[PDB]
Amino acid sequence: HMSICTSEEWQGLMQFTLPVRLCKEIELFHFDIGPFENMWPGIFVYMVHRSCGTSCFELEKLCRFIMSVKKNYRRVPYHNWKHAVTVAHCMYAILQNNHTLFTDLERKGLLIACLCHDLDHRGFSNSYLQKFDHPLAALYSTSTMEQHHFSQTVSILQLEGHNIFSTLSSSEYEQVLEIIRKAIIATDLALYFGNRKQLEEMYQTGSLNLNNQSHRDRVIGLMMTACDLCSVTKLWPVTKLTANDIYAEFWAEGDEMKKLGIQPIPMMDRDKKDEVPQGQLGFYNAVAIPCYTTLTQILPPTEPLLKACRDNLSQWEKVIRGE
Ligand SMILES: Cc1nc(C)c(CNc2nc(C3CC3)nc(Cl)c2C)s1
Ligand SMILES: [Mg+2]
Ligand SMILES: [Zn+2]
Gap between the Cα atoms of 18 and 22, Å rounded: 7
State in Å: Cα 120 to ligand 2 middle.
10
Ligand 1 pocket by Cβ (under 6 Å):
78, 189, 229, 231-232, 243, 246, 249-250, 267, 279, 283
Rounded distance, CA 11 to CA 255, Å? 41
Residue 90 to residue 140: CA distance in whole angstroms = 28
Nearest-angstrom CA–CA distance, 280 and 320: 10
Expressed in angstroms and rounded, the spacing between residue 250 Cα and the centre of ligand 1 is 8
The HSE-up count of residue 59 (CA atoms within 13 Å, CB side) is: 12
CA distance 11 to 15: 7
Torsion of CA 50, 53, 56, 58, to 10 degrees: 90
> In order of start, what are the domains of the chain with their CATH numbers?
1-323 (1.10.1300.10)
Compute φ and ψ for 184, nearest 5 degrees: -65, -45
Q: Whose CA is nearest to atom 10 of ligand 1?
A: 246
State the distance from the centre of ligand 1 to the C-alpha of 246, rounded, in angstroms: 6
Residue nearest to atom 18 of ligand 1 (CA): 229
Residue 183 to residue 191: CA distance in whole angstroms: 12
In this structure, the residue with its CA closest to atom 19 of ligand 1 is 229
Distance 95 CA to ligand 2 centre (A): 21
Nearest-atom number in ligand 1 for the CA of 242 is 17
Q: How was this structure determined?
A: X-ray
Nearest to 47 by CA among 101, 119, 112, 98: 112
* Phi, psi values for residue 90, rounded to 5°: -60, -40
What stretches of 53-80 show up as alpha helix (H) in DSSP?
59-71
Max Cα distance, the chain (Å): 59
Ligand nearest to the CA of 227: 3
Catalytically active residues are 79
Nearest ligand, CA of residue 240? 1
Q: Which of 230, 283, 311 to mutate to test the pocket of ligand 1 (most atoms within 8 A of CB)?
A: 283
Residue to substitute in 117, 229, 246, 289 for testing ligand 1 pocket (most ligand atoms within 8 angstroms of CB): 246
* Residues 1 and 27 sit within 8 Å (Cβ to Cβ): no
